[PDB]
Amino acid sequence: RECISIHVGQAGVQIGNACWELYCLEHGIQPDGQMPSDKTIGGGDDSFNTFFSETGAGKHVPRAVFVDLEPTVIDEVRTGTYRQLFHPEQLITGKEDAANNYARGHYTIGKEIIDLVLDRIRKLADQCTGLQGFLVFHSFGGGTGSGFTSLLMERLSVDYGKKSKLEFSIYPAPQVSTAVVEPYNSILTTHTTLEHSDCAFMVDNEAIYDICRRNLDIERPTYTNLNRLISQIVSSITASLRFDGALNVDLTEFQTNLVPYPRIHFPLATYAPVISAEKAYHEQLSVAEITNACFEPANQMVKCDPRHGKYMACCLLYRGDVVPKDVNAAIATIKTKRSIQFVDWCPTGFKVGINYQPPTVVPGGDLAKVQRAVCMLSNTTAIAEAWARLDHKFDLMYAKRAFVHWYVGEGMEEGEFSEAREDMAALEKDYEEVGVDSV
Amino acid sequence: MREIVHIQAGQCGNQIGAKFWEVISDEHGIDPTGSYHGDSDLQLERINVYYNEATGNKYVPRAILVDLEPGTMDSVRSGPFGQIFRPDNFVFGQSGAGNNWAKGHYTEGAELVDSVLDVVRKESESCDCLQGFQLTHSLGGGTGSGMGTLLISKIREEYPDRIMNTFSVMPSPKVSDTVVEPYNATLSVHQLVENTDETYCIDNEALYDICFRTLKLTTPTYGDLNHLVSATMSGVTTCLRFPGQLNADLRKLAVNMVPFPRLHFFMPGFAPLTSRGSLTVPELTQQMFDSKNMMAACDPRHGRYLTVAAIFRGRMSMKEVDEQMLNVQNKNSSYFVEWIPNNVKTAVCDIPPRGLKMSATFIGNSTAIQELFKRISEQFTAMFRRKAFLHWYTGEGMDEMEFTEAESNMNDLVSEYQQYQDATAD
Amino acid sequence: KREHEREVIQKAIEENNNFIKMAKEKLAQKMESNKENREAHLAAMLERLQEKDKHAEEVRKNKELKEEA
Numbered sequence A: 001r002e003c004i005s006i007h008v009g010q011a012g013v014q015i016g017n018a019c020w021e022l023y024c025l026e027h028g029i030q031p032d033g034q035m036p037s038d039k040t041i042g043g044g045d046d047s048f049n050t051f052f053s054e055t056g057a058g059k060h061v062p063r064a065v066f067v068d069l070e071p072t073v074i075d076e077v078r079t080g081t082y083r084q085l086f087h088p089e090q091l092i093t094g095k096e097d098a099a100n101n102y103a104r105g106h107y108t109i110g111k112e113i114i115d116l117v118l119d120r121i122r123k124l125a126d127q128c129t130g131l132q133g134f135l136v137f138h139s140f141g142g143g144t145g146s147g148f149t150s151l152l153m154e155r156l157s158v159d160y161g162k163k164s165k166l167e168f169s170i171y172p173a174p175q176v177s178t179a180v181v182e183p184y185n186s187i188l189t190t191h192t193t194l195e196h197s198d199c200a201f202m203v204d205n206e207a208i209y210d211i212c213r214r215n216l217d218i219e220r221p222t223y224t225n226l227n228r229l230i231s232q233i234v235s236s237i238t239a240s241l242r243f244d245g246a247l248n249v250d251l252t253e254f255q256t257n258l259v260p261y262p263r264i265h266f267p268l269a270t271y272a273p274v275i276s277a278e279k280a281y282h283e284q285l286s287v288a289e290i291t292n293a294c295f296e297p298a299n300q301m302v303k304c305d306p307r308h309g310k311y312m313a314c315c316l317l318y319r320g321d322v323v324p325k326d327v328n329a330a331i332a333t334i335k336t337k338r339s340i341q342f343v344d345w346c347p348t349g350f351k352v353g354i355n356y357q358p359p360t361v362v363p364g365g366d367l368a369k370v371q372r373a374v375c376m377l378s379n380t381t382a383i384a385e386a387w388a389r390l391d392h393k394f395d396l397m398y399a400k401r402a403f404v405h406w407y408v409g410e411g412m413e414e415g416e417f418s419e420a421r422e423d424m425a426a427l428e429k430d431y432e433e434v435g436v437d438s439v
Numbered sequence B: 001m002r003e004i005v006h007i008q009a010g011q012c013g014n015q016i017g018a019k020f021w022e023v024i025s026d027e028h029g030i031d032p033t034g035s036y037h038g039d040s041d042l043q044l045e046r047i048n049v050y051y052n053e054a055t056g057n058k059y060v061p062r063a064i065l066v067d068l069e070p071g072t073m074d075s076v077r078s079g080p081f082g083q084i085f086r087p088d089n090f091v092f093g094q095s096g097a098g099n100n101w102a103k104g105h106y107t108e109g110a111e112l113v114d115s116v117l118d119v120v121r122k123e124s125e126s127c128d129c130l131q132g133f134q135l136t137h138s139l140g141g142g143t144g145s146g147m148g149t150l151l152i153s154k155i156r157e158e159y160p161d162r163i164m165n166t167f168s169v170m171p172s173p174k175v176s177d178t179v180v181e182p183y184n185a186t187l188s189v190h191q192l193v194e195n196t197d198e199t200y201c202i203d204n205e206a207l208y209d210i211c212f213r214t215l216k217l218t219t220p221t222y223g224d225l226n227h228l229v230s231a232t233m234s235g236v237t238t239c240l241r242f243p244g245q246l247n248a249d250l251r252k253l254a255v256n257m258v259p260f261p262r263l264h265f266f267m268p269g270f271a272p273l274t275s276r277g278s279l280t281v282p283e284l285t286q287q288m289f290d291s292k293n294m295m296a297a298c299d300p301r302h303g304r305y306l307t308v309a310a311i312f313r314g315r316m317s318m319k320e321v322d323e324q325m326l327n328v329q330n331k332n333s334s335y336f337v338e339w340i341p342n343n344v345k346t347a348v349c350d351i352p353p354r355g356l357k358m359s360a361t362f363i364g365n366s367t368a369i370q371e372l373f374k375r376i377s378e379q380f381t382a383m384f385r386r387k388a389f390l391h392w393y394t395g396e397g398m399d400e401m402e403f404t405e406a407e408s409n410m411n412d413l414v415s416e417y418q419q420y421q422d423a424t425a426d
Numbered sequence C: 001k002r003e004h005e006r007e008v009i010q011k012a013i014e015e016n017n018n019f020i021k022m023a024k025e026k027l028a029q030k031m032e033s034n035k036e037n038r039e040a041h042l043a044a045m046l047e048r049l050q051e052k053d054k055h056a057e058e059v060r061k062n063k064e065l066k067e068e069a
């Protein structure tokens, strides 16, 4: 029961760098891949083996692939503290990036390297007794993150069919955006990928940026700060696959309980508690307190107001000092609050899980080591607010065909821009249809 | 990895271009012998963008020096860094163009262009991944203007998927008395509209006014004017030479700065500009967006900004920069097109320029740039209506229609800038 | 019922297979249409500069024919 992570572009690679660093600390894997606590050498059916393969020498190798169309970012990995952890074939780099151009990442530069990426992925898959699916980390805005990811997703649908594909996407934010055409790249990748991904977790950089300032007193956050925080959400989601437990979810479970309709598969994550060490000092937070924090809009990962929408499904993943009795009471209270509205076609609307391994913080980080934490994955109609903001920015530029020549110069037709935008128009409509009360 | 090939044509290109290499070589710790005498390791992270590496850990500029008057070549060799340039990359002519565009584009430049492209080819083949070319030249002379645009077309012909960037210097009556300068410029603009992805407009009328009005130099010299350009050129290329992720290469810059292929004429700016006989982040920000700090003789408040790139240099509070860029954008909302969201991008480099602690360079694609082209069309049509000095060009084979097409095409470009200046969101 | 059970698993297989083929087909024409476009966007861009050489030689020809003092 195994998962392969694919990290694409600067954002995906740099996010993976934080996630795999956290995985090693959670499992006690050293930067050279050795895990002393593991006594089954060269193999095993342990829970952590879903994400780590093993060699006869006792090394624990991530079941991951790093791909970028320029080597600047992945070279850090090849020389960083965790360079020994990855086999050289796992890290794949071109020589010329996509220049914030979806078309270059999909057609011009992407096709140069797609076949090699699939071959290295296939070698990882052949090392599997049973493969659940793929975890794809990328950014909506970059040329490689959008253009190449869409090509990879389409190719994966062919080589592996209906096998699960889950995305971790980075929604553009002007605070740190390095491209004016990011709206074009996001609408195009979303449309191209929309029918290939079974579930996509979006993260709005602006939301993370505000959370880091407010909750962690970080006066001017950097990608390092943001990426560690994303890692906690990714760690919590994968915790049920990497750690052995009786109250876990797996890819198939929480997919089946979060996605009511194929196109409506964009939940927004919420994590709690996000606290600095100063405030954590002499302050321990209860299961109910962190459970209530998940429904406060301030702690969301996409700028939106769930109060102005309706919940269709909530997945609450607790980890740490959490007892079933506390969890049941917390969710019981939520079901009494009327500020939290569920659609009328979802009476049972809570998937629940508990893992007993406590959260881990990387040394030198800003998050405090807490005893219990919770991640909530909620599919609410409020997420459509995010699509509306990005579609409006798409419209403003496309009305004047601004920047479109860069895409036509790389082979695309104006039809793909309207075709993609009409798909987003339908999706915006689908999100209001599902929010209407039944007859 | 990401290599740029520099080219400089004419006296103007060679003098502004020679200063470019003196300035950036100092910034990277390269002395005229090509040796590295620097302290911090960020000086070499991206040294290969503009410098080839040779045995002995000597760095040689990836530069090609060109002119149709051989005397120029000696001037560069004698200069402060004249011995750093690779000697085979000198490509000299015989006589000189005499400020005749047709000779540099068709007759004497054509006979020399193939020798230049050979040096171009040799330099490009030693690049791990070539990203593009940058040309320094003037539009009023005869060699940089005529042969420069020809070299652009021939390079685009042989490297059509690489970016072509130029630093084009624009004639002014205030700086040179030559009478046919309006002809040469209008003819080169007609070329640069089609064959370059992005062009930094350097206007001597703006450089002279800055040297006279702001720096109080009653008799500015090309050394004074070229001190301004070198500061600008160093600023508008620092994203390309130092670690960062905003407009880090020439294509990423073009994609953020060029909403429409013809509208690729930028309005450079620099701050501070203080006399030797006389600074905070809010001040830097206000000064950049002041018309008196623009290297093009246009007022941005007479038009609208399609896209803007601001580069800050020095040790400073990034939080302070974020606020001030936000402040100036929404305090001047009316001067930014509403139909291009988030069209102002800000980069910060820890390393400041020489002599200063905090610098700010401004790259603006403004519809106000049309004021410059309207100045030239006025001068151009003033003489073309009477066909003055037109025999200089027809004598080399040109027809009168190439002048009308160049005139009409420049007038179309001005009309296009106005179309988007008056455009609405709804 | 056993007949129904076989009809169901077979449908699932036919579901997956069609997903692959609509995917494989949609990708193939979209990379081919794109090929045509970028080929033609270059084919005509360099036929643009044969007219600029047929005109470069035309100019140089009109000079030598003007040198007939």
Ligand SMILES: Nc1nc2c(ncn2[C@@H]2O[C@H](COP(=O)(O)OP(=O)(O)OP(=O)(O)O)[C@@H](O)[C@H]2O)c(=O)[nH]1
Pocket (backbone or CB within 6 Å): A008, A009, A010, A011, A012, A014, A015, A068, A069, A070, A097, A098, A099, A100, A101, A105, A139, A140, A141, A142, A143, A144, A145, A146, A170, A171, A172, A173, A176, A177, A178, A182, A205, A223, A226, A227
């Ligand atoms: N959270 C987070 N977002 C990032 C990071 N790096 C880039 N981004 C975002 O990604 C978008 C730009 O895409 P990139 O990942 O930088 O570009 P790319 O994927 O390498 O593709 P190319 O531009 O063609 O090289 C912007 O919206 C950034 O805000 C990161 O390290 N962390």
Ligand SMILES: Nc1nc2c(ncn2[C@@H]2O[C@H](COP(=O)(O)OP(=O)(O)OP(=O)(O)O)[C@@H](O)[C@H]2O)c(=O)[nH]1
Pocket (backbone or CB within 6 Å): B009, B010, B011, B012, B013, B015, B016, B067, B068, B069, B096, B097, B098, B099, B100, B138, B139, B140, B141, B142, B143, B144, B145, B169, B170, B171, B172, B175, B176, B181, B204, B222, B225, B226
């Ligand atoms: N700022 C500045 N402008 C210059 C300089 N040299 C020439 N110019 C300008 O360039 C124009 C004349 O072009 P030149 O470079 O002298 O001519 P050329 O390109 O060498 O071509 P020919 O001399 O005709 O062979 C005029 O408009 C001058 O104002 C310079 O060193 N600095």
Ligand SMILES: [Ca+2]
Pocket (backbone or CB within 6 Å): A038, A039, A040, A041, A042, A043, A044, A045, A046, A054
């Ligand atoms: Ca084992």
Ligand SMILES: [Ca+2]
Pocket (backbone or CB within 6 Å): A038, A039, A040, A041, A042, A043, A054, A057, A058, A059
């Ligand atoms: Ca082992």
Ligand SMILES: [Ca+2]
Pocket (backbone or CB within 6 Å): B175, B220, B221, B222
């Ligand atoms: Ca002078």
Ligand SMILES: [Mg+2]
Pocket (backbone or CB within 6 Å): A009, A010, A068, A070, A097, A142, A144
């Ligand atoms: Mg990149």
Ligand SMILES: [Mg+2]
Pocket (backbone or CB within 6 Å): A246, A247, A248, A249
């Ligand atoms: Mg279970």
Ligand SMILES: [Mg+2]
Pocket (backbone or CB within 6 Å): B010, B011, B069, B096, B097, B141, B143
């Ligand atoms: Mg000269």
